[PDB]
Amino acid sequence: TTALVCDNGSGLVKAGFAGDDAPRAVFPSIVGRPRHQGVMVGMGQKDSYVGDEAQSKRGILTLKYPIEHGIITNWDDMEKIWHHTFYNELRVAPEEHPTLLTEAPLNPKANREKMTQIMFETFNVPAMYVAIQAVLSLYASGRTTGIVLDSGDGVTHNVPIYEGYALPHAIMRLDLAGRDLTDYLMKILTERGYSFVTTAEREIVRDIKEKLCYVALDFENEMATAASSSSLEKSYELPDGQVITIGNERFRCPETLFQPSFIGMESAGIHETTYNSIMKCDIDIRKDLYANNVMSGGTTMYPGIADRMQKEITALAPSTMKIKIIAPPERKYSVWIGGSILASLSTFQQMWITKQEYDEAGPSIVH
Amino acid sequence: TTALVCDNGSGLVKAGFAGDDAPRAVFPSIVGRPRHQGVMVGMGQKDSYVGDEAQSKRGILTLKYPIEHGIITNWDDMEKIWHHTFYNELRVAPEEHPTLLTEAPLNPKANREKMTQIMFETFNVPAMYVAIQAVLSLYASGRTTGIVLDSGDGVTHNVPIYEGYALPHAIMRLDLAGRDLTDYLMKILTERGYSFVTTAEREIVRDIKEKLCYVALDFENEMATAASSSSLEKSYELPDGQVITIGNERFRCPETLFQPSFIGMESAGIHETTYNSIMKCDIDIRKDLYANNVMSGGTTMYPGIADRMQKEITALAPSTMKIKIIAPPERKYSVWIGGSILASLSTFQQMWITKQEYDEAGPSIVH
Amino acid sequence: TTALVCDNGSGLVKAGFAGDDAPRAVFPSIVGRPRHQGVMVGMGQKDSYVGDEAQSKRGILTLKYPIEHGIITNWDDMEKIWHHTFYNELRVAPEEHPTLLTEAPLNPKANREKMTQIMFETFNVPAMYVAIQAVLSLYASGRTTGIVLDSGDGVTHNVPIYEGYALPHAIMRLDLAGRDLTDYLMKILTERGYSFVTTAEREIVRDIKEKLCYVALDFENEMATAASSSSLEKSYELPDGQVITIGNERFRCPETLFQPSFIGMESAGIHETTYNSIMKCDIDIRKDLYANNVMSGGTTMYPGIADRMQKEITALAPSTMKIKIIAPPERKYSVWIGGSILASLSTFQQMWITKQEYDEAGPSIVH
Ligand SMILES: Nc1ncnc2c1ncn2[C@@H]1O[C@H](COP(=O)(O)OP(=O)(O)O)[C@@H](O)[C@H]1O
Ligand SMILES: Nc1ncnc2c1ncn2[C@@H]1O[C@H](COP(=O)(O)OP(=O)(O)O)[C@@H](O)[C@H]1O
Ligand SMILES: Nc1ncnc2c1ncn2[C@@H]1O[C@H](COP(=O)(O)OP(=O)(O)O)[C@@H](O)[C@H]1O
Structure with missing residues (x-):
């Protein structure tokens, strides 16, 4: 009877037992x-x-991909990878111990109901519970206060937390980054004449986004540093072995996070949506938030993501106030790390919902 | 009730019981x-x-020859050699056990219908089935993945296969080699004043193509190695006993496979049509295909066919990618070996089409 | 000094002076x-x-064909047909007046640069400009709003336009139809035993696709209307004078546009890729788009193309919303008609890029 904690994160799905620094199964969800x-x-x-x-x-x-934007569109397949994750990959009987289940802040509740459902009547589980993407990033990072930033492939959102009291009215979910960043990349690469469009090749594209993107860090002179002189163009052999040439769009693809007029969906941009989340918070509460914003999304390994947020968030806010963006490398497993912490520790053991509770009222109880 | 498997291969026709390393009857079809x-x-x-x-x-x-290019032009004669192959040669009653029947990938379906026909109403057979030339080369060679190359006398084609999932849109059939190689040879030999043209003597010509051809392997200096100095001219006594002198066209006849501007029919050439088949396959799928291409056609014994494909296929494709052409000597029976494997093993026993099915719908069912 | 407007459209290439209902030279590009x-x-x-x-x-x-998929692979030949189109065919000195130049939406910019290049240093032209395939279909059709559909031989794409404000993030280019439709037809016709494969005969095949294809319009009972009873099989004499028999694949070849699992390249299909283009557009913007989709590609004369899109697009979208596919017969010259309209009218006279601008910055200015 030891806790195993899994996530919906689209992208890679991540699951493992309680009390560990990394899940035992990390594999993409397809x-x-x-x-x-x-x-x-x-x-x-x-x-x-x-x-x-x-x-x-x-x-x-x-x-x-069964997980569209945090919401799960196709159930019939989705249960398979769960049906797998319990049996193959990490090899466990379906009935041993409960499971903490990662999940999106603002997504429709109808998401988490059928999901709590198929954790019972199809294969019965010794209780259950469903936490939020962000709230586990602090249990991992150990902070109590502080705003987060989470992206991943599923959806991008930020949830300012203070002393474990959430500020739900300030939770800003804008769906971006993740998959949608590649779909701009497959869109942009045709600049150089690489026609990548098929469902299977998409990941070949992704493994470029993995390898070389970074973040432009004031990409005004950067494009001119690209255009004028070429020192930054790098080549990537692809599974056939043929060379690819890039570098005008290397930085330009993640740059869309700061100007989603490149991707074309117009909402905000990720740097200031945290600010426009902060401003919606209280006047008092916000001093330390600027210092504590964690930005652990699982997307952002971009070498210089944090470095530009530093630049951009200081361009916002009163400059008299110290802003600190902590970018711990152990993230991208962070949201899972919280599970292996939260569920492992106690005072949470009564926070599970036993199959009783599902027999008590129904799926509506998780809310 | 044991399976006997026969082929249409023009040229030699090959038939024998299941579970054997070589058919019991190998004789040319005339x-x-x-x-x-x-x-x-x-x-x-x-x-x-x-x-x-x-x-x-x-x-x-x-x-x-009743088998023109895989397509069978004359039926009335064709049934005789079948009528023979069941009775004389290998001696069997027409009704014992089903038969797997070899057949061409891209040929008109009207080929295989009258052929499935005359396997029933004229002489009734305990069911039937018709496989493809290539698909049995892997069951023989034991591979699962990998592209093939098949020529024979009937027609030349290549069918990339991956995990027993065919890639039909990439199947490239160019009709060449086989008979058409001799008809260039009877054409070219008149260089030395040998007028061979009659239907019966053609095979006398073929038995030259059997004995000495090889493949030029970079035949630029080769012709100059022929022209300038003569070490490679060999003589062949022919059924009357008179000497023949050759060697400028020894390599030059099969060389037409790589430049069908010698024969005059302009399509591609066989070396790169596999490449131009690969390129039509997926980006991911193609890494191993370059390693696995079997080239078992039944034509190609040419001492140094594989050696030049090595040279030519590497001249194509990204050089960073390892290409391996396997040239097993047991080929030329390969397409039959698959039969004595596939039909011999099981899960195929329900893949036959019984005389019922022909009574069910009709000849159209094989498709 | 009057505008002459030419296109890259592969297939037929089309060029003529401004202010006319049809170009003076329509001839295939080879x-x-x-x-x-x-x-x-x-x-x-x-x-x-x-x-x-x-x-x-x-x-x-x-x-x-120098124009592969909108992208132009071979320049050296390509300049000849331009070198021709200015001199013979329509007979004009290279230096009189600018030229509007048709061109593909999503193709690599390196396409249009060398092309703007060879419109200057090789033969100097009084300025220049390069529009997009679709954007000229509205200037022709006179609409302001509305989504398009364009195919031609070069590439298939659709560009929703609203009040002359493009929606680039929604532009969906899937390469299909055109040439690639014949290459499936030469592939499929071998069903009846017609082996058409050579570079020169391909057009003989095309002139079948011209004459009889239409579109199946719910081709479920259609194949059964083909298979069971034969009323629709038509014969076509070919340049030697020999009869051809067809009709199971008459409708089946263009049908691949709606299921590119026949051709084997798996992306979408053309009917819903417009829908999946619409859905990417805004909620408000899309009401009229469903009414205005023009489908002028230059491929589609298929008698009943529009009739099936009607059926298929209504099967998508909320049925409460009126969808109207306008199929003006004057298309297939449409993309050129826009040129003889746009460039003919004014406010565009300053939108040219003079040889100055090319001397100003360089070929990079067109972007
Ligand atoms: N080094 C990297 N550079 C750029 N993008 C990355 C990198 N590593 C991961 N990503 C992107 O971040 C995603 C992380 O997915 P995941 O963390 O499972 O989503 P979620 O946070 O919803 O669980 C990957 O699928 C990939 O698209
Ligand atoms: N050693 C050889 N050298 C050159 N050509 C050969 C050699 N052996 C066979 N061939 C040619 O290959 C043909 C093989 O015929 P076959 O395998 O029956 O065709 P299919 O593969 O269609 O069954 C022979 O008819 C002959 O023309
Ligand atoms: N009546 C028709 N039926 C079917 N296909 C046609 C018909 N007329 C033309 N086509 C195809 O449409 C193509 C139009 O070419 P074109 O308009 O030049 O391409 P683009 O739109 O890129 O300029 C022709 O080459 C031909 O392949």
């Missing part, structure tokens, strides 16, 4: 299906492939 | 007819001669 | 070369043949 006729009468093949099992054989497969 | 007046009132003679029965007595006979 | 030895010592022959000059004598020639 339900793949063959788009071609079976020749191998060898029925050793499968209906569909999930995770790395699918991620290994790609161009053959078609790829469906 | 329906011969006498072109002269019968003197022997001895009616012990026949209407027509088939296979080696014909191949023994040639200049007397006229030779008609 | 640079042909003889694949055989010259016998006529008569040097009256040429290095290469372009356009109809080539299109007249085909089997002799080899055919290279």
Whole structure:
């Protein structure tokens, strides 16, 4: 009876036992299906492939991310990767111990109900509970106060927290980064004549975004530092072995986070939406928030993301006030680290909802 | 009730029981007819001669290959050699056990319908099935993934296969090699004043192509190695006993496979049509294909065919990617070996189409 | 000094003066070369043949389309047909008046730079400008708002436009139809035993696609209306005079536009990619787009293309919303009609880029 904690994070899905610095299974969430006729009468093949099992054989497969923007669109597949994650990958019987379940702040409640559902009547679990993406970033980072920033592939949001008292009216969820950053990248790369568009190749694109993006850090002279002289163009061999040439859009793709007029969806931009989240907070409360903003999203490894937020957030706010963006490298597992902390420790053991409670009222109880 | 598996391969036709490393009957497909007046009132003679029965007595006979380019032009004769192959040669009653039937990838379906037909209403067979030339080369070679190359006398084609999921849109059939290689050879040999043109002598020509051709392997200095100094000219006694002198065209005849501007039919050439087949495949899928291309056609014994493909395919593709052309000597029976494997093993026993199915819908069901 | 407007459209290339309902030169874009030895010592022959000059004598020639998918792969030939189009065909000095130049929405900018280049230093032109395939379809159709659909031989794309404010993030370019539709047709016709594969004969195939294709319009019962009873099979005499039999694939070839699992390249299909373009547009903006979608591609004359889009687009979208697909017959010249409108009218006269501007900064200015 030890806690295992899993996440919905689209992208990679991450699950492991309580009391550990990293989950035992980290694999992308995909339900793949063959788009071609079976020749191998060898029925050793499968209906569909999930995770790395699918991620290994790609161009053959078609790829469906079940987690759209934090909301989960397709349930039938989604239960499979859970059905997998409990059995293969990390190998556990479905009934041992409860599970803390990561989940999105502002998403529709109908998300978490069917999800609490299929954690019971299909395969019964010794209770359950569902926390929020951000609230576990502090249990991980150990802070009590402070605003967060979370992105990941599922959705980008920030949840200012002070002494474990949330400020829900200030929670700002703008859906961006994540997948939507590649879909701009597949869009932009055609500048150099690379036509990448198919469901299976998309990840080949992503592994560019992984390797070289960073953040422009005042990309005015940066484009001119790209345009005029070329020192920053790097080449990336791709699974066939052919060279790719880049560097005008290397920084330019993540730059869209600060000007979503590149991607075309017009809302805010991520740097000041934290500010425009702070301003909605109280006058008193905000002094330390500027110092404590953690920015652990799981997207942002960009070498110089934090460095530009420093520049941009100081351009906002009164300059007399010290702002500190902590960028711990152990993030991208952070939201999971909180699980292996929160559920591991106690005073939470009565915060689970047992199958009783689901028999008590119903799925509506989690709210 | 044991499976016997036969092929359409024009050229030699090959048939034998399941579970064997080589068919029991390998004989060329010809329906011969006498072109002269019968003197022997001895009616012990026949209407027509088939296979080696014909191949023994040639200049007397006229030779008609019923299998044109994989497509079978003449049915009336074609059923005879089948009518033979079941009775004489390998001696079996027409009704014992089903038969797997080899057949061409891109050929018109009207090919395989009349062929499935005459496997029923004329002589009834306990079910049936028709596979593809290439798909059985992997069951033989044991590979699962990998692109093929098949030529034979019937037609040349390549069918990239990955985990027994075919890539039909990438199947490249260019009709070449086979018979059409001799018809260039009978064309080229007149260089030395050998006028070979008659239907019966054509095979005398072929037995040169059998013995000495190889492949030029960068035949730029090769022609100059032919022209300038003569070390490579070899002589071949022919059924009368007269010497033949060759060697400028020894390599030059199969060389046409890489430049079908010698034969005059302009399409591609065989080396890069595999490449131009690969490129049509997916970006991901293609890494291993370059390593796995089997080139088992039944034509290609040419000592140094594989050696030049190595040279030519590396001249294509990104050089950072390892390409491996496997050239197993057991080929030329390969496409049959697959039959004695596939049909021998099980999960295929329900993949036959019983005479029921032909009574169910009709010949259209095989598709 | 009157405007002449030309297009890149692969396929046919179309050019003519401003202020006209149709270009003065409509001829296919090919640079042909003889694949055989010259016998006529008569040097009256040429290095290469372009356009109809080539299109007249085909089997002799080899055919290279310089415009691949909107992108132009071969420049050296491409300048010839321009070099022709200015001199022969429409007969004009290279220096009279600027030229509006049609061009693809999402193609790499390196396309249009070398193209703006060779409009200056090789032959100098009184300024220049390059518009987009779609944006001129409204100036032709006279609409201001509305989404388009464009295909042609070069590439298929749709560019929703509202009050002359483009929605670039919603521009959906999937490369399909055009040439790639024949290459499936040459692939499919072998069903009936017609082996058409050579570079010169390809157009013989195309002239079938011209004559009889239409669109299946719910081709479920249609195939059964083909299979079961044969009323729709039509015959086409080909340049030798021999009959062709068709009709199972008559509708089936353009049908691939709605299911590119026939051609094998898996992306979307053209009917809903407009929908999946609309959905990416704003909630407000989309009411009228459904009414205004023009579908002028230059491919689509298919008798019943618009009729099935009606069926399919209504199957998508809320049914409470009126959708109207206008299919003006004057299209296929439409993208050119816009030129003879846009450039003819004024407020555009300062939108040209004079040779000054190219001397100002360089080719990078067009962006
Ligand atoms: N080094 C990196 N550079 C840029 N982007 C990255 C990097 N590492 C991960 N990402 C992006 O961040 C995502 C993290 O996904 P994940 O953390 O599972 O989402 P969530 O936070 O919703 O769980 C990856 O899928 C990838 O798209
Ligand atoms: N050693 C060799 N060298 C050159 N050509 C050969 C050699 N052996 C066979 N061939 C050619 O390859 C053909 C193989 O025919 P076959 O395998 O029956 O065609 P298919 O593959 O369609 O069944 C022979 O008919 C002959 O023309
Ligand atoms: N009546 C028709 N039926 C089917 N296809 C057609 C018909 N007319 C033209 N096409 C196809 O549409 C193409 C139009 O080419 P074009 O308009 O020059 O391309 P672009 O739009 O890029 O300029 C032709 O080359 C032909 O392939």
